[PDB]
Design a protein around this nucleic acid. Structure first.
Ligand SMILES: [Mg+2]
Ligand SMILES: [Mg+2]
Ligand SMILES: [Mg+2]
Ligand SMILES: [Mg+2]
Ligand SMILES: [Mg+2]
Ligand SMILES: [Mg+2]
Ligand SMILES: [Mg+2]
Ligand SMILES: [Mg+2]
Ligand SMILES: [Mg+2]
Ligand SMILES: [Mg+2]
Ligand SMILES: [Mg+2]
Ligand SMILES: [Mg+2]
Ligand SMILES: [Mg+2]
Ligand SMILES: [Mg+2]
Ligand SMILES: [Mg+2]
Ligand SMILES: [Mg+2]
Ligand SMILES: [Mg+2]
Ligand SMILES: [Mg+2]
Ligand SMILES: [Mg+2]
Ligand SMILES: [Mg+2]
Ligand SMILES: [Mg+2]
Ligand SMILES: [Mg+2]
Ligand SMILES: [Mg+2]
Ligand SMILES: [Mg+2]
Ligand SMILES: [Mg+2]
Ligand SMILES: [Mg+2]
Ligand SMILES: [Mg+2]
Ligand SMILES: [Mg+2]
Ligand SMILES: [Mg+2]
Ligand SMILES: [Mg+2]
Ligand SMILES: [Mg+2]
Ligand SMILES: [Mg+2]
Ligand SMILES: [Mg+2]
Ligand SMILES: [Mg+2]
Ligand SMILES: [Mg+2]
Ligand SMILES: [Mg+2]
Ligand SMILES: [Mg+2]
Ligand SMILES: [Mg+2]
Ligand SMILES: [Mg+2]
Ligand SMILES: [Mg+2]
Ligand SMILES: [Mg+2]
Ligand SMILES: [Mg+2]
Ligand SMILES: [Mg+2]
Ligand SMILES: [Mg+2]
Ligand SMILES: [Mg+2]
Ligand SMILES: [Mg+2]
Ligand SMILES: [Mg+2]
Ligand SMILES: [Mg+2]
Ligand SMILES: [Mg+2]
Ligand SMILES: [Mg+2]
Ligand SMILES: [Mg+2]
Ligand SMILES: [Mg+2]
Ligand SMILES: [Mg+2]
Ligand SMILES: [Mg+2]
Ligand SMILES: [Mg+2]
Ligand SMILES: [Mg+2]
Ligand SMILES: [Mg+2]
Ligand SMILES: [Mg+2]
Ligand SMILES: [Mg+2]
Ligand SMILES: [Mg+2]
Ligand SMILES: [Mg+2]
Ligand SMILES: [Mg+2]
Ligand SMILES: [Mg+2]
Ligand SMILES: [Mg+2]
Ligand SMILES: [Mg+2]
Ligand SMILES: [Mg+2]
Ligand SMILES: [Mg+2]
Ligand SMILES: [Mg+2]
Ligand SMILES: [Mg+2]
Ligand SMILES: [Mg+2]
Ligand SMILES: [Mg+2]
Ligand SMILES: [Mg+2]
Ligand SMILES: [Mg+2]
Ligand SMILES: [Mg+2]
Ligand SMILES: [Mg+2]
Ligand SMILES: [Mg+2]
Ligand SMILES: [Mg+2]
Ligand SMILES: [Mg+2]
Ligand SMILES: [Mg+2]
Ligand SMILES: [Mg+2]
Ligand SMILES: [Mg+2]
Ligand SMILES: [Mg+2]
Ligand SMILES: [Mg+2]
Ligand SMILES: [Mg+2]
Ligand SMILES: [Mg+2]
Ligand SMILES: [Mg+2]
Ligand SMILES: [Mg+2]
Ligand SMILES: [Mg+2]
Ligand SMILES: [Mg+2]
Ligand SMILES: [Mg+2]
Ligand SMILES: [Mg+2]
Ligand SMILES: [Mg+2]
Ligand SMILES: [Mg+2]
Ligand SMILES: [Mg+2]
Ligand SMILES: [Mg+2]
Ligand SMILES: [Mg+2]
Ligand SMILES: [Mg+2]
Ligand SMILES: [Mg+2]
Ligand SMILES: [Mg+2]
Ligand SMILES: [Mg+2]
Ligand SMILES: [Mg+2]
Ligand SMILES: [Mg+2]
Ligand SMILES: [Mg+2]
Ligand SMILES: [Mg+2]
Ligand SMILES: [Mg+2]
Ligand SMILES: [Mg+2]
Ligand SMILES: [Mg+2]
Ligand SMILES: [Mg+2]
Ligand SMILES: [Mg+2]
Ligand SMILES: [Mg+2]
Ligand SMILES: [Mg+2]
Ligand SMILES: [Mg+2]
Ligand SMILES: [Mg+2]
Ligand SMILES: [Mg+2]
Ligand SMILES: [Mg+2]
Ligand SMILES: [Mg+2]
Ligand SMILES: [Mg+2]
Ligand SMILES: [Mg+2]
Ligand SMILES: [Mg+2]
Ligand SMILES: [Mg+2]
Ligand SMILES: [Mg+2]
Ligand SMILES: [Mg+2]
Ligand SMILES: [Mg+2]
Ligand SMILES: [Mg+2]
Ligand SMILES: [Mg+2]
Ligand SMILES: [Mg+2]
Lengths: 272, 44
RNA sequence: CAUGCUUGAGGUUCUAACUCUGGUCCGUAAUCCGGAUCGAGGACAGUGUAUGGUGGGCAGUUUGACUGGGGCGGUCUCCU
RNA sequence: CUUGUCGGGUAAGUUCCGACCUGCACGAAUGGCGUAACGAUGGCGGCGCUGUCUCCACCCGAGACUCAGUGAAAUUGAAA
RNA sequence: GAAAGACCAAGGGUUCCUGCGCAACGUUAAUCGACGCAGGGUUAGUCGGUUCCUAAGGCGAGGCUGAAAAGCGUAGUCGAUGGGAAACAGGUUAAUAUUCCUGUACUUCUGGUUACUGCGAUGGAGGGACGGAGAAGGCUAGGCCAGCUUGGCGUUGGUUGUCCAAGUUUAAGGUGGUAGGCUGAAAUCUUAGGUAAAUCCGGGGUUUCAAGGCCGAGAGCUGAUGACGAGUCGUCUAGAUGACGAAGUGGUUGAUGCCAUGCUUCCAAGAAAAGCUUCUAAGCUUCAGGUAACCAGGAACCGUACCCCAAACCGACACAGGUGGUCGGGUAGAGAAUACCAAGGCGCUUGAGAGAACUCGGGUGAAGGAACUAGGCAAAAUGGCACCGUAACUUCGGGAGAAGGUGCGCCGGCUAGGGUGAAGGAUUUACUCCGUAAGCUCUGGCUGGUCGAAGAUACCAGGCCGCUGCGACUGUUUAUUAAAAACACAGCACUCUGCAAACACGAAAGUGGACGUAUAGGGUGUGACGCCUGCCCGGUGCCGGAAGGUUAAUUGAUGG
RNA sequence: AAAAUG
RNA sequence: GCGGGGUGGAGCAGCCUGGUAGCUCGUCGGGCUCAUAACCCGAAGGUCGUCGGUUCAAAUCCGGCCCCCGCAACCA
RNA sequence: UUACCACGGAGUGAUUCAUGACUGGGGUGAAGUCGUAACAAGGUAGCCGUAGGGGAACCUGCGGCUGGAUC
């Protein structure tokens, strides 16, 4: 539930908090955690390759099962947790033979639920099974692109895709972006959408809440000198006297940058 | 006022030391160029 | 006008070249790298070479003289 | 142009506040018009307080002054 | 005197102590010295390293890539600022001491003998193992007071006494399992799991019980008839030497230190690996190995002097500068502020005069009170606690300590409580529950008296108010003339990107983005909030279209 | 289909 | 200092390239209407700012003058 | 000498009158200017609520009413 904060301070006036009272408030499952360090946006040459990255809080990595290849054994949701490195929540499952695993929590799984997988599973939410025998018109999430590779699409909060068509050994499904893309019918998906649908109804409230997530301030190119940006220079405030452009000379107000040409045959319709 | 030289012997041996010049061929020519001048120090 | 012999252009398909930052087996005690085998794409992508376009992202430079200081203006060759 | 004109404040106000519209040459995300809280931010006005001032006077320490010791500097064509 | 005292780390390297010196060094002299000469001085199983383990990162057999040099990276092995065994009190030198000596401990290893025995990993499980803030307790160091012992009887009125001075100390360890924290326990059958196996862990079933199991400061008892202790006696040259050596106790207060890696709560969701416990695999199997008791021995190597908020380190100097962490007493005080002191340390390496102008740092000022000036710059003024009271406006939080006002010292009378706490009582008969007079300590209330010019009496300790421009606010910025209206910001919008993502660094391999997946990632402009954001696609960009016109390498008909 | 006023 | 203009009552073509002044509104006269407006038909109306010059011929070329409108007037 | 207390002072609010540059509409007045919104089916049937636009009456969208003409 979203909670609006009282204007007790100048930095609490516009804070809208997403608070869920049903998340687990103990400790995460230790056997499925490993360390991860920050990079600052620097590659192995030590140079900044992606800017406005740095700082934040220490985090652990949670081994989330994106494959979901225990076909047949029924599971049971044991708790829904917080993940520092998603925007969705995660569900800890206990199978009929120990073997606890993390998955991405669907929209309405709390403490029971079976969440079986494989061919022949029911059509309830949270069940995983190949795209071939998912009824046409239903919504899916966590779609994988290569068999055995793991889920790639529809993974953030409240995300979903819809199965539109099916013919041959391919299925066509409409992505959250508005794009029609054909996917192999051998690949797997999960029914329903992703939890934490209200993630978008939040307000950070202050400059310090951006830094808690590891994001550094963004200077705008007009506030620079000609040596630093194509937009910089001029006496007084100027409006970037040329057509708006990237720091490295690429136009950004409308120019298309896709140049794949290998996977064009899997794009039925563009997003735009 | 803080001055530029703040001494430390661990950071002195790891940057200018003998085993740091012999790691790369560019530092192995500093040593040869100093053995030819006739230097007595030859390494930090 | 079917034909037989060739080549130009396009579409469709197949696998056997190439591709895989997909699975499992071995080297092996190893999310590298090789080999084997499944799976997908497939003569496409990609790279070499030749070529048209774009390209201040980057570079080497030029941007005249007279002048009651320089600039602005005017003048710069020939005839009475 | 310009200290535009009118009103307020002051004994007297090229600054300040409220208006007019003749906008040399405002104007709507190089955002337009307002706005509580905030500011070692710009302008103006009050109360208290005062050596800021009329106009300076006395007093207390450290130099300056004399004695003993050590002992520089910039500069310099030559100087009756 | 929250250092200008004491101690660690870095850094320095003989500056440490003694004997002999004054040429030079020391901003003066020097008999002195961090100066010259010559000797001396640093003692470890437990302190710090090394050996064991890893983080960021480095190197990197093969490998991939690259004109050459070389780049990246797998296995691996280096890398603390972190993890992981164990010692304290007293004495002692001119110079060392948790090291030497005395006394009392603790950890670990080796070789034997006996007795019983399934041993075995690099692999599996457990454990190590952890955030911000807050709060209620328990305790300890430390501090005070009383009593006790020893000495004193005061150059000037009184001082044989509810008088004055000093001391009233004692660790590690062992025993103890307390305040308190966490957890259900045992037996039996079984298994889509932990890459193979497992009696270990995870999962499932049945039976029984309300009691076990792990942590945990601290008190007390002992260590300790011992050490220490004012001082006294003997011996010697004013100081050394040996022996003896009094009291050594209770009550209150109480930490920012320990219980506490605990408990509650909130999002920003809070290191790894080894040491450690346990299970089996390959191998032995009557050797090996393991488990207990006893006996005998061992713990190697390196650093230990001195400065260390500075005259010894970084600044050319014996330089108003800079330098990480620990301790930190008394009286006032909320306080680690401030004032006066303790322990301890110092008076800052030129002086002596005299008392001109002028300069620097201050004190007081008649009448006036900003008339000064670019401008109230500077100065003056306000300043604490309790109580009363307080405007426009507002995003309902605020503005607000708005503004303004009253009381405050000391000495008595009466009076209401809290905390600790003998005797007593109870049964959980003992590290226990309830509760108590005296004493000690902490909060008040109403009622007088009294001194001064003035009682928050010194140090310390907000000046306030009314209109406006700008930027919403906290924050950042030109090290060394600009701290702002500039940058950032939360919020808004446009646009690109379907994952081997766009994009960026790399002749390339590769890496970041991201172990993320359109509620996500990059670029661009604007900049909380409220009301809004109007017309123009002619120019230049971008997006889409494919008909026609032009149009490169290439090909080579024809002609000469 | 156009059709204002006095 | 440089540049562009002055044409019926009003606002705009004609000036390039010398020989022919045009468009809309307005004005006048007659129509339709009970009357005005709107609408229809027919006419008038500018020797081209002024002077001077070349030319057979100047709104048109070349000069001065009087009127306007734009820029520029900078470094100390 | 203390207690009560009038005059008089200090700070800060509320309320009510007079006035104020400049501005918003209202009413009245004459042979003024622009159009013609309503009254007939007033020549696009009018009114009500609401929103946007425009020299002005007013126009347009959404819903409602008949207090609408012809058959
Ligand atoms: Mg960014
Ligand atoms: Mg993240
Ligand atoms: Mg920005
Ligand atoms: Mg931004
Ligand atoms: Mg930007
Ligand atoms: Mg700027
Ligand atoms: Mg700038
Ligand atoms: Mg740069
Ligand atoms: Mg540029
Ligand atoms: Mg400007
Ligand atoms: Mg600029
Ligand atoms: Mg510009
Ligand atoms: Mg370095
Ligand atoms: Mg050197
Ligand atoms: Mg095939
Ligand atoms: Mg990748
Ligand atoms: Mg491979
Ligand atoms: Mg190809
Ligand atoms: Mg090609
Ligand atoms: Mg190519
Ligand atoms: Mg250039
Ligand atoms: Mg060019
Ligand atoms: Mg360039
Ligand atoms: Mg050159
Ligand atoms: Mg040049
Ligand atoms: Mg140049
Ligand atoms: Mg040239
Ligand atoms: Mg010149
Ligand atoms: Mg000139
Ligand atoms: Mg001149
Ligand atoms: Mg001259
Ligand atoms: Mg010129
Ligand atoms: Mg002016
Ligand atoms: Mg005025
Ligand atoms: Mg007046
Ligand atoms: Mg003034
Ligand atoms: Mg706009
Ligand atoms: Mg601007
Ligand atoms: Mg502007
Ligand atoms: Mg704005
Ligand atoms: Mg704009
Ligand atoms: Mg703005
Ligand atoms: Mg504004
Ligand atoms: Mg600030
Ligand atoms: Mg202000
Ligand atoms: Mg004034
Ligand atoms: Mg004096
Ligand atoms: Mg002298
Ligand atoms: Mg050292
Ligand atoms: Mg020496
Ligand atoms: Mg000495
Ligand atoms: Mg001596
Ligand atoms: Mg001498
Ligand atoms: Mg001397
Ligand atoms: Mg010496
Ligand atoms: Mg190690
Ligand atoms: Mg490493
Ligand atoms: Mg390497
Ligand atoms: Mg190699
Ligand atoms: Mg190691
Ligand atoms: Mg090591
Ligand atoms: Mg360490
Ligand atoms: Mg010493
Ligand atoms: Mg000993
Ligand atoms: Mg074993
Ligand atoms: Mg392990
Ligand atoms: Mg730790
Ligand atoms: Mg916590
Ligand atoms: Mg904490
Ligand atoms: Mg005590
Ligand atoms: Mg006595
Ligand atoms: Mg006496
Ligand atoms: Mg006496
Ligand atoms: Mg004891
Ligand atoms: Mg003990
Ligand atoms: Mg207990
Ligand atoms: Mg030592
Ligand atoms: Mg020492
Ligand atoms: Mg010290
Ligand atoms: Mg000190
Ligand atoms: Mg020094
Ligand atoms: Mg000195
Ligand atoms: Mg010093
Ligand atoms: Mg103190
Ligand atoms: Mg102090
Ligand atoms: Mg003392
Ligand atoms: Mg001195
Ligand atoms: Mg003197
Ligand atoms: Mg003075
Ligand atoms: Mg004074
Ligand atoms: Mg006086
Ligand atoms: Mg005075
Ligand atoms: Mg006076
Ligand atoms: Mg006064
Ligand atoms: Mg004045
Ligand atoms: Mg004056
Ligand atoms: Mg001041
Ligand atoms: Mg002052
Ligand atoms: Mg007050
Ligand atoms: Mg105020
Ligand atoms: Mg009196
Ligand atoms: Mg202050
Ligand atoms: Mg202003
Ligand atoms: Mg600001
Ligand atoms: Mg702050
Ligand atoms: Mg900074
Ligand atoms: Mg500066
Ligand atoms: Mg500032
Ligand atoms: Mg800035
Ligand atoms: Mg975005
Ligand atoms: Mg801006
Ligand atoms: Mg266009
Ligand atoms: Mg167009
Ligand atoms: Mg196109
Ligand atoms: Mg009319
Ligand atoms: Mg007529
Ligand atoms: Mg200038
Ligand atoms: Mg109407
Ligand atoms: Mg009408
Ligand atoms: Mg009508
Ligand atoms: Mg009509
Ligand atoms: Mg109404
Ligand atoms: Mg309209
Ligand atoms: Mg309407
Ligand atoms: Mg209607
Ligand atoms: Mg109705």
């Amino acid at each position: 539930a979203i909670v609006k904060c009282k204007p007790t301070s100048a930095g609490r006036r516009f804070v809208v908090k997403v608070v869920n009272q049903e998340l687990h408030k103990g400790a995460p499952y230790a056997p499925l955690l490993e360390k991860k360090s920050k990079s600052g946006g620097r590659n192995n040459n030590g140079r900044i390759t992606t800017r406005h990255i740095g700082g934040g809080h220490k985090q652990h990595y949670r081994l989330v099962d994106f494959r979901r290849n225990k076909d047949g054994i029924p599971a049971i949701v044991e708790r829904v947790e917080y993940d520092p490195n998603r925007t969705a929540h995660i569900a800890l499952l206990k199978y009929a033979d120990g073997e606890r695993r993390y998955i991405i929590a669907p929209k309405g799984v709390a403490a029971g639920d079976q969440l079986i997988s494989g061919i022949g599973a029911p059509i309830k939410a949270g069940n995983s099974m190949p795209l071939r025998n998912i009824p046409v018109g239903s919504t899916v999430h966590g779609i994988e692109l290569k068999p055995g590779k793991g889920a790639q699409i529809a993974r953030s909060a409240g995300a979903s895709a819809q199965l539109v068509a099916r013919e041959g050994a391919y299925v066509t499904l409409r992505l959250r972006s508005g794009e029609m893309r054909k996917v192999l019918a051998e690949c797997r998906a999960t029914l329903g959408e992703v939890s934490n649908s209200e993630h978008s109804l939040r307000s950070l409230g202050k400059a310090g809440a951006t830094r808690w997530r590891g994001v550094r301030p963004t200077v705008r190119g007009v506030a620079m000198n000609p040596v630093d940006h194509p937009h910089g220079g001029g006496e007084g405030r100027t409006s970037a006297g040329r057509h708006p452009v990237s720091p490295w000379g690429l136009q950004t107000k409308g120019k298309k940058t896709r140049s794949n040409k290998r996977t064009d045959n899997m794009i039925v319709r563009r997003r735009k | 006022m803080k001055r530029t030289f703040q001494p430390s012997t661990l950071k002195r041996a790891r940057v200018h030391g003998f085993r740091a010049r012999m790691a790369t061929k560019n530092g192995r020519q500093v040593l040869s160029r100093r053995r030819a001048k006739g230097r007595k120090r030859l390494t930090v």
